[PDB]
Design a protein around this motif. Structure first.
Motif, PDB file in Angstrom:
ATOM      1  N   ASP C 161       1.423  -0.911   0.265  1.00 46.53           N
ATOM      2  CA  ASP C 161      -0.092   0.049   0.325  1.00 46.53           C
ATOM      3  C   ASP C 161       0.447   1.449  -0.086  1.00 46.53           C
ATOM      4  O   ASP C 161       0.205   2.252  -0.706  1.00 46.53           O
ATOM      5  N   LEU C 162       2.048   1.299   0.836  1.00 49.90           N
ATOM      6  CA  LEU C 162       2.861   2.456   0.965  1.00 49.90           C
ATOM      7  C   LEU C 162       3.082   2.506  -0.202  1.00 49.90           C
ATOM      8  O   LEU C 162       3.760   4.170  -0.589  1.00 49.90           O
ATOM      9  N   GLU C 165       1.402   4.065  -2.762  1.00 52.88           N
ATOM     10  CA  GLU C 165       0.919   5.399  -1.940  1.00 52.88           C
ATOM     11  C   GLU C 165       2.124   6.272  -3.103  1.00 52.88           C
ATOM     12  O   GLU C 165       1.874   7.480  -3.365  1.00 52.88           O
ATOM     13  N   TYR C 166       3.265   5.881  -2.394  1.00 53.34           N
ATOM     14  CA  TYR C 166       4.229   6.303  -3.743  1.00 53.34           C
ATOM     15  C   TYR C 166       3.806   6.509  -4.910  1.00 53.34           C
ATOM     16  O   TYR C 166       5.390   7.878  -4.823  1.00 53.34           O
ATOM     17  N   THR C 168       2.245   7.240  -6.451  1.00 51.26           N
ATOM     18  CA  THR C 168       1.038   7.720  -6.831  1.00 51.26           C
ATOM     19  C   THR C 168       1.025   9.297  -6.834  1.00 51.26           C
ATOM     20  O   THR C 168       0.914  10.166  -7.488  1.00 51.26           O
ATOM     21  N   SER C 169       1.820   9.252  -5.318  1.00 48.99           N
ATOM     22  CA  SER C 169       2.797  10.619  -4.999  1.00 48.99           C
ATOM     23  C   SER C 169       3.142  11.261  -6.079  1.00 48.99           C
ATOM     24  O   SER C 169       3.420  12.528  -6.444  1.00 48.99           O
ATOM     25  N   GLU C 205      -5.041  -1.544  -1.132  1.00 47.56           N
ATOM     26  CA  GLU C 205      -6.446  -0.006  -1.138  1.00 47.56           C
ATOM     27  C   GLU C 205      -6.367   0.290  -3.029  1.00 47.56           C
ATOM     28  O   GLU C 205      -7.170   0.372  -3.264  1.00 47.56           O
ATOM     29  N   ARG C 206      -5.536   0.249  -3.779  1.00 46.93           N
ATOM     30  CA  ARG C 206      -5.541   0.524  -4.981  1.00 46.93           C
ATOM     31  C   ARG C 206      -4.683  -0.895  -5.679  1.00 46.93           C
ATOM     32  O   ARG C 206      -4.586  -0.744  -6.220  1.00 46.93           O
TER      33      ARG C 206
ATOM     34  N   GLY D 344       3.507   6.818   8.178  1.00 48.01           N
ATOM     35  CA  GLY D 344       2.847   7.243   7.619  1.00 48.01           C
ATOM     36  C   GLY D 344       4.322   7.570   6.445  1.00 48.01           C
ATOM     37  O   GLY D 344       5.684   7.988   6.804  1.00 48.01           O
ATOM     38  N   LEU D 345       3.747   7.689   4.995  1.00 45.00           N
ATOM     39  CA  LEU D 345       4.636   7.289   4.279  1.00 45.00           C
ATOM     40  C   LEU D 345       5.812   8.179   4.073  1.00 45.00           C
ATOM     41  O   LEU D 345       7.150   8.574   4.417  1.00 45.00           O
TER      42      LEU D 345
END
Ligand SMILES: [Mn+2]
Ligand SMILES: [Mn+2]
Ligand SMILES: [Mn+2]
Ligand SMILES: [Mn+2]
Ligand SMILES: [Mn+2]
Ligand SMILES: [Mn+2]
Ligand SMILES: [Mn+2]
Ligand SMILES: [Mn+2]
Lengths: 385, 385, 385, 385
Positions: C161-162, C165-166, C168-169, C205-206, D344-345
């Protein structure tokens, strides 16, 4: 790739005649008359058939019923010139054999197993079988306490010794071939591999009377290299017979048509048999999948022989190819045939080139060139040369 | 369940000494001094240690380096009273052995392999080894063309015959034990099972000089029943030595501590060894998982011995239990021990009770009572009786 | 059967660059410069290469060393026009990862694993990788108590998930591909099959960011049908990448060149990939056997691509053959594509032809004709048409 | 270790009812009346029984025959207070299903399969089943061409979607549980593992209606870790039901009584079920070996439950032991339960302690202490603490 009887392709009655009962399934095909099987297999270019006693003569048959079954069978054989090179006993189907034949815990069952076998040896000799196969499918255990294996091996030796005494007493030329299988239907089966069977034979009173009948699928059920096993059997002079089929590694006994399952193993097997000049039957112990009707049965049987003949051609072309012959030299297959120390122990001990002055690093640096050789083998198998 | 020396527990230097390098992983532990291994193993109640040549003396050592390594080791042995019942050659690690030792395609490598072995046999005898193990881990192939197995077996027989000639010539009492393995690090290894090794031995010039050193994990890598294999080895009089460890069925060689992997199999093994009065070392060829530090190494080693001793207790209790003795009778284990036909072939042939008059249905109807027996076994193993 | 870059054949640096260390063996080959690998693979008709971080940049490299390694690599890529379609993290070799990366029991190790991964994701994006592979080789256990698998799966989800997130960010287009393996080097590995990985992804999550990177050998280490697994991955829309090699059923991970091991499985795989229009890299994760020198390395690599191209030709000829097309109809492969009940539940319930008036025996009597079809497939594979 | 109803032990009619027909063997036991099975199981302390349609009502029964069978069964249930928590369809035995039910190539067979299922769902609900199991034993292939797996999965999804529509339409509370199996009786079976089944479910229209019914032996036939698989199922919230039995690694489906086969795996399974507070039936899908008479059948069934209860005791004792609690801390099982990066990330990225300043060597040096923990586990299992 048309089979001819000279190819010595043989089939068990129980192969094309398998009605398709499995552990989760009822029959999908009607029973075959052995007479039809003989005639149909002859048409396909087969050399011969084989049988369990109970394939030819229904269990519990009267003497007169027995006579009629055999008479009809021999008429079919005589009409077609089909041979019966091998026969065997069913010591697995009847519930009496639920804990084995020769190594049943119940002594009365062991004696019955021997009498049942001996009766069929006589019939085998009448029909001209050169090999009598024994697959001890029920010899073994699901649990540790159930079977003292040392005792069981004592009983197994006793049985095989008695069979040897019998054939000798009768002046029969027939020889025995023990068929290994690691498991199924027993949780573990005694003499589970070619190795175990070869070892056991050496302890029989007349070892010369016994060889192995290895089956492709059986060795592969232990994840073993079937060609390697056949090589050791040949080395021991003990390949009396062979069962050809297909198997997809380690699961239940699939008995696919030969060529199916491990195709490359089939290639290397045929290469070895032909190279070694194995002169025994090319016997198929296979089951047409229960998906099939009788058209599919005969197609599957034909496929057995076709696949052997394709592989035979490809193996021959491999060996005949001067490029392959050079690859074999590059990989020092020829050096493997040289004695290690024909000069003797003392010479070896006194040879500084063999230790003190051996350049380990130079030797280590030498590539074996096995991958080039193997891709030549692949090219030949696939006809991509 | 405290181990003491008379339990005959032994360990390879390479076991507790394993630095935890695997095909995907660097070392997780520093190298152990053999002197420390000897001392620590002694404190745990070990009887003895074993070694490959290259475990004790770094490959390519000078004479002075060799003497210093052996000197220190001998001092440790003398200090602790630890024995060396077995030793072996490393014919697998060095790149020169990448296509084998005794069955390398390259003749000069085969000769080197023999000289390397013979050198270490002398040291083994000096240090009091009764058994010399050979694991031919590099004997085999990844591809079909690379190895002619008949030629390879010729070379293998030559090698072992020469080793037999050597020990005979020196008046040594040491015997050889061939250790089978089906695969790893070769795609397929020659003499892959106890069976194949037993068979091979029978073709050596002096078979009395050779037995097997079976390993729990190795037979189980072929999905075979290890107790059954050990039974056949005992039957043949060929269990010269044994390697004890754990394995979870058909995968890479795990070398878990004894008792781990197939626990039931461990129980039935100990039951058999103790029942048969095997008097050889209880040797652990295991690797403390690379997750472990040195505290974990010694815990794992202690676990090997602890598990043997628990299983020994439970097996003895099983066999002693009047309820089990009754269950064994109910299952006709006693009948299994009786000759099938001590009355002889002719008497068997003439015995109508063995065929014509045999009530197959009555025999078939007799339950074997194996499940009751096995649950008694389970109860005893789990201490739930 | 000459490969062209348009064929999208790719190789890991670690494949042709494998020095031949195994669990019982030291290196047999010197290290390869990635630059040489790029140039040599280009010459052989490769499309691209892939890397672990630690293949390209030695672990523990300074920033300036790191820069120099990458610079030299990019010069080779730029010179040849070779691509880097996929990259991955080494979370298995360093002893820190002995109990895993993302699911290490030690929390500080889990955090380090993520930081190590993220660093290399950045590099992957710089080099134009479309797929980032994660093989959790150290995620799992040798013992039951060591790893709470529910907790481990919580940690694994958190990690992935992290990573999601990375990317995506950062607005990266790169996607993740999880590589299943059932065992080795851990006794059991988490997400052991294509199935387990597919199931896990659905709980991220994605999920759209994650697919699978199945490897031939890995699925076959569980005795599974690799083409079947690939079919389910395709069905799920989740075949982002694939690893091609050979494996002989259930043993250690052999990583033979593609086409070796299960040849027929290779045929059916290629048939499926081409039929499905898989547009991803044809990536080889294989090891030239340690028997080989560098000539053998490049021969083995060339063999990977050759075997794909032969199988592609044979599969295409199979599918294009009107006789095969008729066989497929005979076997009702076409009926399999028809919806079972597009007429809806109520219609089905009310349809007497579907139960009350269904002639089960007539349906049962219909042969599937699978054996004829399969022998057509065999003929085509072997070029025996 | 007396079982009582609140232990939730259940048995299939087909388990104790197995007549002992195998692929090589005729029945060794007479058919059991379900009424007797219910009564005998009740006396042993069973909670419940389960059935295939065709176990309770002979295939092709008239309405009057059907009513009589169900009447007698219901009377037995009412007499004893035995429950029926689960039922299932036989879509494997009848020849019509030789190429599958839901994924038969023949459309009319697919429709029949659904109607046969829906009929039995009604009866299942009447008798109080909370779970309806589907084992697609005939879904798959022996050959590559026979089954387009993408098309098959389309048909499989359609079937399960329709079953979901049906139960929804009737306002039933019953849920589906898909039972994976890798092979047997098909060469390869679709949805071969817990993983594949979980993945498939996520693509159904109403995934909440479907879970898995994993069987010990089935996962172990792929050499997979059954506890690990069950963990993933629990993680997904999809363990609706479970089949308990014994299996000895990678071979035919043995269906030994629970506790037999992989004893350690049985321990870790019970530990997990109890720890996770699984509240579903403890269902035994096993076969009393065909060696057994009816006394042996009931002994074997009693053994299933006994072994569960022993293992439950030992697992509870393990988890309760302060020494084990300390060992779990030493092995950082508690750290595994803590989020990797709840900070968190961005915090992770900015944390130098997670990369630049992470002492990899200090981390690597920490032993996991897994071997001490596992030997505590072994001690507890064997009652040697
Ligand atoms: Mn077979
Ligand atoms: Mn056979
Ligand atoms: Mn080992
Ligand atoms: Mn060993
Ligand atoms: Mn691999
Ligand atoms: Mn890979
Ligand atoms: Mn089962
Ligand atoms: Mn089941």
């Amino acid at each position: 790739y048309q089979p001819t009887p000279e190819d010595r392709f043989t089939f068990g009655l129980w192969t094309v005649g398998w009605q398709g009962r499995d552990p989760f399934g009822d029959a999908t095909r009607r029973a075959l008359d052995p007479v039809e099987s003989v005639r149909r297999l002859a048409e396909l270019g087969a050399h011969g058939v084989t049988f369990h006693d109970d394939d030819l003569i229904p269990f519990g048959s009267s003497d007169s019923e027995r006579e009629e079954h055999v008479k009809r069978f021999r008429q079919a054989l005589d009409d077609t010139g089909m041979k019966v090179p091998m026969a065997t006993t069913n010591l697995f189907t009847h519930p009496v054999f639920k804990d084995g034949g020769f190594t049943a815990n119940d002594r009365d069952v062991r004696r019955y197993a021997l009498r049942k076998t001996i009766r069929n040896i006589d019939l085998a000799v009448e029909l001209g079988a050169e090999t009598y196969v024994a697959w001890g499918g029920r010899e073994g255990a699901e649990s540790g306490g159930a079977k003292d294996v040392r005792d069981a091996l004592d009983r197994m030796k006793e049985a095989f010794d008695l069979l040897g005494e019998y054939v000798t007493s009768q002046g029969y030329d027939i020889r025995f071939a023990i068929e290994p299988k690691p498991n199924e239907p027993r949780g573990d089966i005694l003499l589970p591999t070619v190795g175990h069977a070869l070892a056991f034979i050496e302890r029989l009173e007349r070892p010369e009377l016994y060889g192995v009948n290895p089956e492709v699928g059986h060795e592969q059920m232990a994840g073993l290299n079937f060609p390697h096993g056949i090589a050791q059997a040949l080395w021991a002079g003990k390949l009396f017979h062979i069962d050809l089929n297909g198997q997809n590694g380690i699961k239940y006994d699939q008995d696919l048509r030969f060529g199916a399952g491990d195709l490359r193993a089939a290639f290397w097997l045929v290469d070895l048999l032909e190279s070694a000049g194995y002169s025994g039957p090319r016997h198929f112990d296979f089951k047409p999948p229960r998906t099939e009707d009788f058209d599919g049965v005969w197609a599957s049987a034909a496929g057995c022989m076709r696949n052997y003949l394709i592989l035979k051609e490809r193996a021959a072309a491999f060996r005949a190819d001067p490029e392959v012959q050079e690859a074999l030299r590059a990989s020092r297959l020829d050096e493997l045939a040289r004695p290690t120390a024909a000069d003797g122990l003392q010479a070896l001990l006194d040879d500084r080139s063999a230790f003190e002055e051996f350049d380990v690093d130079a030797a280590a640096a030498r590539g074996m060139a096995f991958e080039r050789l193997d891709q030549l083998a692949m090219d030949h198998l696939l006809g991509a040369r």
